[PDB]
């Protein structure tokens, strides 16, 4: 952490967010490579997502896990607010999916394993995640998957990754995470989310109905796991331990539980 913008040399823009840009950066005193996220206070207040941001930063701060992107610290200008983040050199899972069209079973199972580990750790800390997107998944130097969005919750846009209970306005719990796994496991293997449609309304209906089909190249194990994850009823969804111990996972995953 630092107290000012002058503590960092700003490098190439890693990406542009809706509220502000992210840069590659180096802490001058220690030559420390990190990611510097810039946000505008006015923009945050326009949506009133300021308090949400503060809470999410607070939650993220207490999370220490190899498969979760680290928040080193933060400061403000004003107007600008700066987040100091772990730099993931291998970019997003989204871009990787864009490059490889789809992932093989081993890579998919591995990513799912890392995800389930991180989320299990979060559940131990009574931390529940919102929707998980591939653009919000980064890759470390060893290619390790890292959850990078700060969408956490402590109390019990595109709809592609939201569970039925959240889009229907029903009460949601930790089970949400498992649903996300399902979607991701599908997308990794197929190249597109299972409820993708050209229309928001269509996607809404397809999610609410849990209306999806498998391409022929999807194996029985993958179909089984995904089908168990994509339950309309959150209660019928398995636990993360059952996921980590799923035959298909254990058969294809490189990383242990």
UniProtKB/Swiss-Prot annotation:
ATP binds at residues 18, 37, 86-88, 135-136, 149. Phosphorylation at Ser-208 decreases the kinase activity. The active site is at residue 131. One of its GO terms (molecular function) is protein heterodimerization activity. Changing residue 40 to A: Decreases the interaction with phosphatase type 1 isoforms. There is a cross-link at residue 133 (Glycyl lysine isopeptide (Lys-Gly) (interchain with G-Cter in SUMO2)). Its EC number is 2.7.11.1. Changing residue 212 to A: Decreases the interaction with phosphatase type 1 isoforms. Mitotic serine/threonine kinase that contributes to the regulation of cell cycle progression. Associates with the centrosome and the spindle microtubules during mitosis and plays a critical role in various mitotic events including the establishment of mitotic spindle, centrosome duplication, centrosome separation as well as maturation, chromosomal alignment, spindle assembly checkpoint, and cytokinesis. Required for normal spindle positioning during mitosis and for the localization of NUMA1 and DCTN1 to the cell cortex during metaphase. Required for initial activation of CDK1 at centrosomes. This is Aurora kinase A. The gene is AURKA. The chain holds residues 126 to 391 of 403 of the full protein.
């Amino acid at each position: 952490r630092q107290w000012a913008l002058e503590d960092f040399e700003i490098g190439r823009p890693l990406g542009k967010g809706k509220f502000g840009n992210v840069y590659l950066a180096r802490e001058k005193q220690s030559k420390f490579i990190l990611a510097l996220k810039v946000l505008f206070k006015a923009q945050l207040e326009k949506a009133g997502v300021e308090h949400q941001l503060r809470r999410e930063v607070e939650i993220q701060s207490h999370l220490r896990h190899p498969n979760i992107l680290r928040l080193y610290g933060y400061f403000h200008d004003a107007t600008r607010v700066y987040l100091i983040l772990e730099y993931a050199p291998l970019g997003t899972v989204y871009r990787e999916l864009q490059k490889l069209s789809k992932f093989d079973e081993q890579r998919t199972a591995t990513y799912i394993t890392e995800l389930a580990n991180a989320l299990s750790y979060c559940h131990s800390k009574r931390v529940i995640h919102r929707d998980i997107k591939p653009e919000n998944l980064l890759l470390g130097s060893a290619g390790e998957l890292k959850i990078a969005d700060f969408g956490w919750s402590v109390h019990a846009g595109t709809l592609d990754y939201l569970p039925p209970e959240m889009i229907e306005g029903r009460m949601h719990d930790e089970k949400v995470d498992l649903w996300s796994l399902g979607v991701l496991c599908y997308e990794f293997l197929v190249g597109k989310p299972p409820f993708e449609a050209n229309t928001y309304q269509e996607t809404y209906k397809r999610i609410s109905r849990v209306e999806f089909t498998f391409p022929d190249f999807v194996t029985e194990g993958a179909r089984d796991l995904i089908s168990r994850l994509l339950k309309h009823n959150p209660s019928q969804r398995p636990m993360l331990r059952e996921v980590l111990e799923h035959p298909w996972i254990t058969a294809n995953s490189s990383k242990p539980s």
